[PDB]
Symmetry: D2
Subunit: 436 residues, 4 copies
Amino acid sequence: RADVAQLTQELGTAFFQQQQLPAAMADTFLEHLCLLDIDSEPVAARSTSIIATIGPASRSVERLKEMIKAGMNIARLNFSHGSHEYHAESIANVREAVESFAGSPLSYRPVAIALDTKGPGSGPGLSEQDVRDLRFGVEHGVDIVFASFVRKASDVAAVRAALGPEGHGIKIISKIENHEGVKRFDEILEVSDGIMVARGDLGIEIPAEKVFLAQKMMIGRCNLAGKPVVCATQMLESMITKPRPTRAETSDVANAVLDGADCIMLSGETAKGNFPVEAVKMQHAIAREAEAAVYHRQLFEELRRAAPLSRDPTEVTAIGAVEAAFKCCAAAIIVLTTTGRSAQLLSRYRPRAAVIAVTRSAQAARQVHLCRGVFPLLYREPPEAIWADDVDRRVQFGIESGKLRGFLRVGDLVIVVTGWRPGSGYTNIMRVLSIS
Amino acid sequence: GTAFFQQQQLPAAMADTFLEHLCLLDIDSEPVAARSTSIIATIGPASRSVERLKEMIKAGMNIARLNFSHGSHEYHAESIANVREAVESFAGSPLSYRPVAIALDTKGPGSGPGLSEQDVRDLRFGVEHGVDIVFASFVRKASDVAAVRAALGPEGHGIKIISKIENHEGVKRFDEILEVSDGIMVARGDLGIEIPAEKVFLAQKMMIGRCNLAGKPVVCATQMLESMITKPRPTRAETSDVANAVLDGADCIMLSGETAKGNFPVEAVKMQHAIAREAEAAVYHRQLFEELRRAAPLSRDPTEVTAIGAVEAAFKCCAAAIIVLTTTGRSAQLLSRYRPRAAVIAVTRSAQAARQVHLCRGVFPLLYREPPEAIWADDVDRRVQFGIESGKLRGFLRVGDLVIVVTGWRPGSGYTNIMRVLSIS
Amino acid sequence: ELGTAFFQQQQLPAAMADTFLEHLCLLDIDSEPVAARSTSIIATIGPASRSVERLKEMIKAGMNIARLNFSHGSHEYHAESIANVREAVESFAGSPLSYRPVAIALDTKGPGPGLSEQDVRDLRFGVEHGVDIVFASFVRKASDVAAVRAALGPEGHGIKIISKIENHEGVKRFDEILEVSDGIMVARGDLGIEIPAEKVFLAQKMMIGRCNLAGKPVVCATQMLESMITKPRPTRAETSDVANAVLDGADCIMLSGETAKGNFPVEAVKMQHAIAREAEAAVYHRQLFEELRRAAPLSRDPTEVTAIGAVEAAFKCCAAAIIVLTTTGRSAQLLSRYRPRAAVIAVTRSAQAARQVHLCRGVFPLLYREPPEAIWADDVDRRVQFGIESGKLRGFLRVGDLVIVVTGWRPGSGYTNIMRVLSIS
Amino acid sequence: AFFQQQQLPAAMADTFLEHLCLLDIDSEPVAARSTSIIATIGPASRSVERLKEMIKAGMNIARLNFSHGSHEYHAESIANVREAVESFAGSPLSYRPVAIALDTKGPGSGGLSEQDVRDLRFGVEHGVDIVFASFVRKASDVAAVRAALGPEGHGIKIISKIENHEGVKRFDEILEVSDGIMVARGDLGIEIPAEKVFLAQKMMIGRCNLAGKPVVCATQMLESMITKPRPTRAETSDVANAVLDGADCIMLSGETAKGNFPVEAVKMQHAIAREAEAAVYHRQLFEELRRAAPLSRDPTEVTAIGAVEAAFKCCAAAIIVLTTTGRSAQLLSRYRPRAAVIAVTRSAQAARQVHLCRGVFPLLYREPPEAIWADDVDRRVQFGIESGKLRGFLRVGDLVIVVTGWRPGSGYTNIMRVLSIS
Ligand SMILES: O=S(=O)(NCc1ccc(S(=O)(=O)c2cccc(O)c2)cc1)c1ccc(O)c(O)c1
Ligand SMILES: O=S(=O)(NCc1ccc(S(=O)(=O)c2cccc(O)c2)cc1)c1ccc(O)c(O)c1
Ligand SMILES: O=P(O)(O)OC[C@H]1O[C@](O)(COP(=O)(O)O)[C@@H](O)[C@@H]1O
Ligand SMILES: O=P(O)(O)OC[C@H]1O[C@](O)(COP(=O)(O)O)[C@@H](O)[C@@H]1O
Ligand SMILES: O=P(O)(O)OC[C@H]1O[C@](O)(COP(=O)(O)O)[C@@H](O)[C@@H]1O
Ligand SMILES: O=P(O)(O)OC[C@H]1O[C@](O)(COP(=O)(O)O)[C@@H](O)[C@@H]1O
Ligand SMILES: O=C([O-])C(=O)[O-]
Ligand SMILES: O=C([O-])C(=O)[O-]
Ligand SMILES: O=C([O-])C(=O)[O-]
Ligand SMILES: O=C([O-])C(=O)[O-]
Ligand SMILES: [K+]
Ligand SMILES: [K+]
Ligand SMILES: [K+]
Ligand SMILES: [K+]
Ligand SMILES: [Mg+2]
Ligand SMILES: [Mg+2]
Ligand SMILES: [Mg+2]
Ligand SMILES: [Mg+2]
């Protein structure tokens, strides 16, 4: 009580009853569970990204606008079905729906485009159709590749080579769908940007009753590595034909978030189902509840202890900033990033504070949706003559978008993370600012 | 041996942090322990035949649920008789006989404020037919439990009352309901309609946590393997749901339509059995036991003191089992609350207690049918040997294993006070 | 049941704290110690403490082990010291409330590369005079212990060898020395000359920690109350030193010149007694027991498994004592290694074991001399009641208290496998 | 080699038992001694030449015991201390500030005595930094001392001496209004049973550590060194245990005031404190300090925990902080970082007073000002870095954490920076 008494008197008892704060402050995991409250409403913005598969049920520009408003962050194109012409039209429709909100830069929501490959099938490695589809992705500017049936590190090197010199910036998320992928997980994760727990094929390749062990192990190892992990397949399966999900389905979504997943995915629920927008809304609602129920007290202690000592200033600043944010219940951590890396290093410590990432890179703004709790703001202004003033303008842009989206209020504390010189790789400063 | 320490997620169970525990989970680490989470199967047209009920007992059904929201007293009496006929068909081999509890799930109050007149008639039927458990529908306050207890009368004092929490008021008045109940059921079907669907997981995790703290049984119910009503395999969300209910701390998992009216009732029981075994091995006992020990209050009750000493002793030697002699099941329940990895083999002469201890995770009841020996200490030893011989036949024990034996200083309930380290010969 | 006053004594609020910081903040000078003093006091016998009348006063003040320093005096001088100690100890044989066994320890002169000629003759003298313990001076390697062990001839293998670590080599070869020794003495006098004085506290804390991990006795020695050789009261550094040796985990604390040649030998014993009682109540059992439990390897030895189960049971009910039947002292030692807050009352038929168990913190020996009963279970019950009645007589127990009883399944050393919860009647 | 020094295997242990088992007599201390030494000035330590030797041996605070001697005697003691301290001012990168503390006579049979009022006024007139207020029993005793210091003595630190049962019982109210505490074991050991003093010491140190306020352990720490060249085994153990308990300062009374080995007593406390600081179990300590410290919306408090967390993440050689009053350095010190807290200040009084906080190394900035505030700030940072390099705290390639504010004036610390040396 004395460790939260003055902040309780200051912020009020109502503040400490919302977002499962009594449960988050508990001394044991048992007490944390006992303190979970259905009347404790979530306050924070939803941090787990939603990946929606695009298909006949979610292809129209008007339908895509509704899905963006419902919470879709990443659009998945399943190259197991449809022609290149079909997928190019899907891409164009997504971009048209996304840019329809670009008129207001302080509220614009970027949406990443991910290409899910067909896979090797009976083959030993990269198929000829995969090579053509990967070149299509580079030519159409996709942000992410979900590489199907990755079984070893050489499979991801083949995908990287097929993307060529122009696709160096594309993120490769390896799909683990069989026993070999699970057994060679460490070598696959080392060369990948992230992982997808593809439970559909995984549940056929290994006994169905063992999939939860593979999911929890891979999420844990991705969290340890600080790399994005996606939980996928049959999350809200019954919503393909019904307006409401089963009790097992809502539980599954909540548990993927509690496990530590950065992203949650919808496949047939959005691609061919009768309720694509409702499926996105349901994942949004469950993820907000589940994020507030995360036991940050032990989680942060374990992430901190597991993370090795580092002499990289971005790594050092990131842990100092997350520690500072927890100390004052900071509403947000505003970070300036070029590639998204500084925001990713903040995200790996699982702060409760939203990580508002201000970037000039449209691709980085789309790709940071892979990292839990990163809210990208695309800055379109031309540079100031004085670099320090250009930095300050970018920080104020983050505060003003934060106030105009509800993340920040006057009186809040914010943590600002910047670097000492222009260019990527020099983040080294953490500032505590009071919102006026 | 090295092989012993690679099975049943033992590297993951020994980890120093929960993060390291998750990272060490292995799909190739096979479960060795017997399945400790009980399976409740609802009886209906798909699972009423004596031959079908025998298959479900072999698949792992521990409790048969009679849903009094459907069917007449005549229908439920035939269900009871069919269950008992299927259960007693294995009584010829006492070392392998599996007791099966009968639970009566009430229709509920409906629009009424308290106990309905149909519920009073159904509760009397249950007492007259010897049901072991009552799943009391829509419990909203402690007085609802007292009304059910009064309707059971003096002859139904031994029946367990498991309160179903199905609405916001039941969640808010949870502590007072749990205090007077024998346990709880998280009735997710109605709960998901009474409260927002996206909040049911918080109510489930909270109630399971509080029941685990109280040392009282908690059942997770509804739509666990819903798709298996028409399909032979469940969805990825359904297997995850069953595994997570076990990881949350549920003592029992339930099947409703999957066994009452579906096309795969035996397969639905086999699937819950398979998932529960995997999930139990993935329990992080290192932190779990530490938290249960610290949360449990100090006690001057010798059964309570012997139970914690026995669970501590079982962890120290990796005991294959804790064999406990019990009359009412209470000594086995107090062992179960500390969540030992060792199976709790409960030897009893009470057929009702043998059925009712299925409510407690990790309790394997053995019904002893021999008449008492003239010398009490010899009668005690004969029962303990019956526990060892059943354990060996069923695969729980092998020669060379260490077992913890929990007994009392005199006959009669309430006198457990002895813990003994035994080597299996 | 116990009252608010019970939970305010013996630093119980501080012992229940969730963190070590909160434990320190809750220490209270008004919280009085209730438990009997568990850290044994070793007093060096010399001109100031040799008379039978003076030795009776030191026994009453709390002396448990009499140390004979073979660096000074002849065999004839030490034989008279032994006879005077035995005469003073046996002067209380008539009164059960006052009779306490007192061990006799021989501290060797020391080495030369290995065992000196005088040490061989002195060790032979110790065997001939029935000493219980040998404090082997300047042990540097495992072969030094083996030489002392071999010098204990055909008749002295039951004597305990406590190795004195007095130099850099002994500290560096600590693990191999501890493995072959019965215990260790942190001989700070010579150690403080052999290594920099400012590093002695590191060596003391390390050796005490490793001895606690191994479950072997550790003695903290030299200059603990040095100023009391000439002054009636010690310095603030001296009382702090005694308290910190107990808090570190020392089984025994020692007095050298303070008792052998000083002006206040009895007052020095009284002061160590007073400080040790306060320091024992201030032990942070919550984290201590958790760490001892986790550090101790898994065991298939039933004595080791019973001991942890019994200490866990004692903590659960705030047992007034753990009564253990032991012939060699081993069962009492395995209880002592988990640092229970309850007194370990060790009932033995062995006078040697009764004297030697003073090396283990919290062990209160009772020598039992009744003729054996024909029925073994009757003999066991009689020794258990002897422990309860002596406990009642000495203030450890009252009617209504709970005790933990540790016994085995058959006669003979090595079969402890039973833990019972008993109510004092 | 780096990970074998300063008990680093023992500091990384998963349990306190394993931490103890891993303590190594061959693991040498590398960090600068963080626990300050308070030496009592008397006949054996009054000469300017003797005081220079004590400053070199490690004396950080000079204590004037007003229970003995006249105002004329103490004024000469003050002048001799200042002369010895300023004899090293020729080299600003290595100059060591020394605080002057006035220990009052006390109330005796009486609240605040008339002699105490005259002595407190003497202290203000002679510019003392700290007052060790004898026999404090309640919060009103502290208020009386504060009032006696008047308007000219607002900046003086009041360290309350707890010497009796009432002071122990009313501890929380006394600590709330005091700047810190002294565990005055001499009188405490006569007022309460001697066997209970260790409980009072450990409780008060724990509560001061929780409050983030300085605590001094005092009396008979190396008593035998008044006549002997080496201390007893109990005395070295006592000093080590006071440091391990969490004391910010350790004190010498008769050992330096009247003993035959005043310089050797200071050297012995220095040697023991260095060893004891390396044996601190930071893994559990930092976790507990972090959890115990309340949530805060004060940017200095928030920056302090972020900086200590960052220092542990990279094994930073130092945390360089700019402070006017010493407060920013005190808030870093409360989290017990292994990294030295190099406090760069212009205030000569703050530089002397921060010796009360464990691990704070004051540097008195006497370099010319920069016209641009930002350039002035960077220059004070470079000053900390050069003084750290000269004194052995830092080497090229080391990482430091730099703690500054957004605008001039005290109370605005809000920035933490990760900097690579040279
Ligand atoms: O939110 S956490 O901090 N939770 C950790 C946790 C602790 C203990 C258990 S227990 O011992 O199984 C248990 C204990 C009590 C009741 C009970 O029902 C179960 C479970 C979980 C987290 C999540 C993911 C991570 O990767 C991580 O590093 C940390
Ligand atoms: O009684 S114990 O459990 N001692 C607990 C202990 C843990 C951590 C620390 S600390 O982190 O340095 C520390 C120091 C000061 C304040 C503070 O907040 C934290 C000091 C002491 C014990 C004693 C001996 C053993 O062998 C053993 O396994 C356990
Ligand atoms: O996260 P990244 O990709 O390393 O980018 C962080 C970089 O952004 C900045 O804060 C601002 O840099 P720019 O002026 O190039 O946009 C740098 O100081 C820092 O190095
Ligand atoms: O768990 P319960 O119902 O308290 O039953 C435990 C009882 O069983 C026993 O072990 C054996 O008693 P019975 O001989 O009456 O079966 C008693 O000693 C003990 O009191
Ligand atoms: O501590 P120790 O030497 O192993 O002795 C414990 C032994 O004492 C007993 O409890 C009683 O044995 P005795 O009747 O032979 O004295 C044995 O069952 C047990 O093996
Ligand atoms: O520790 P204190 O007393 O708050 O002083 C810290 C102050 O030091 C600074 O970093 C430098 O300020 P000055 O220019 O006044 O020296 C301030 O911005 C900050 O408020
Ligand atoms: O391919 C997939 O996404 C799967 O199998 O889940
Ligand atoms: O009654 C039930 O089982 C439900 O509503 O879920
Ligand atoms: O002999 C001893 O005890 C010593 O040297 O400390
Ligand atoms: O005045 C003091 O410091 C004492 O009495 O200890
Ligand atoms: K695909
Ligand atoms: K019903
Ligand atoms: K000797
Ligand atoms: K004084
Ligand atoms: Mg697939
Ligand atoms: Mg219902
Ligand atoms: Mg010696
Ligand atoms: Mg005094």
